[PDB]
């Protein structure tokens, strides 16, 4: 896909996912430019949960899929993010073993993609 397509897509995900949950504009705000400094609500980590199981990353108990994960990124993110992300679901993908819950499990590993990313993260 082209960056033109990712940059719109975010808002695209976001729309599919964001009405489920009780969420502040700033959180969505600062996870959108890969800031996740701050403490999460229940409804945003399940909001990163849900997020993922769009993408096909995770499965219902927020397991992290690396093989799958690779599989999909040129469905994901533009070619120029491509090098990025393998990183990041390899610095990554042993992340979701430290965490019980589902919710929790997939915003650590987004919180780490954000973290072990070389260059600037997205987030729907």
Same mark, same amino acid.
């Given at each position: 896909?082209?960056?033109?397509?990712?940059?719109?897509?975010?808002?695209?995900?976001?729309?599919?996912?964001?009405?489920?949950?009780?969420?502040?504009?700033?959180?969505?705000?600062?996870l959108? =430019?890969?800031? %996740?400094?701050?403490?999460?609500?229940?409804? @945003?980590?399940?909001?990163?949960?849900?997020?993922? @199981?769009?993408?096909?990353? =995770?499965?219902?108990?927020?397991? %992290?899929?690396?093989?799958?994960?690779?599989?999909? @990124?040129?469905h @994901?993110?533009?070619?120029?993010?491509?090098?990025?992300?393998?990183?990041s =679901?390899?610095?990554?993908?042993?992340?979701?073993?430290?965490?019980?819950?589902?919710?929790?499990? =997939?915003?650590?590993?987004?919180?780490? %993609?954000?973290?072990?990313?070389?260059?600037?993260?997205?987030?729907?």
């Open positions: 896909m082209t960056m033109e397509q990712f940059l719109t897509s975010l808002d695209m995900i976001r729309s599919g996912c964001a009405p489920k949950f009780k969420l502040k504009t700033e959180d969505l705000d600062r959108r =430019v890969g800031d %996740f400094n701050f403490p999460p609500s229940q409804d @945003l980590m399940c909001y990163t949960k849900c997020v993922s @199981l769009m993408a096909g990353s =995770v499965n219902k108990k927020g397991e %992290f899929n690396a093989p799958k994960a690779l599989a999909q @990124l040129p @994901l993110v533009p070619p120029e993010m491509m090098e990025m992300s393998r990183k =679901v390899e610095a990554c993908r042993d992340t979701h073993k430290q965490f019980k819950e589902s919710c929790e499990r =997939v915003y650590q590993t987004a919180k780490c %993609f954000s973290e072990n990313a070389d260059g600037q993260f997205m987030w729907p």
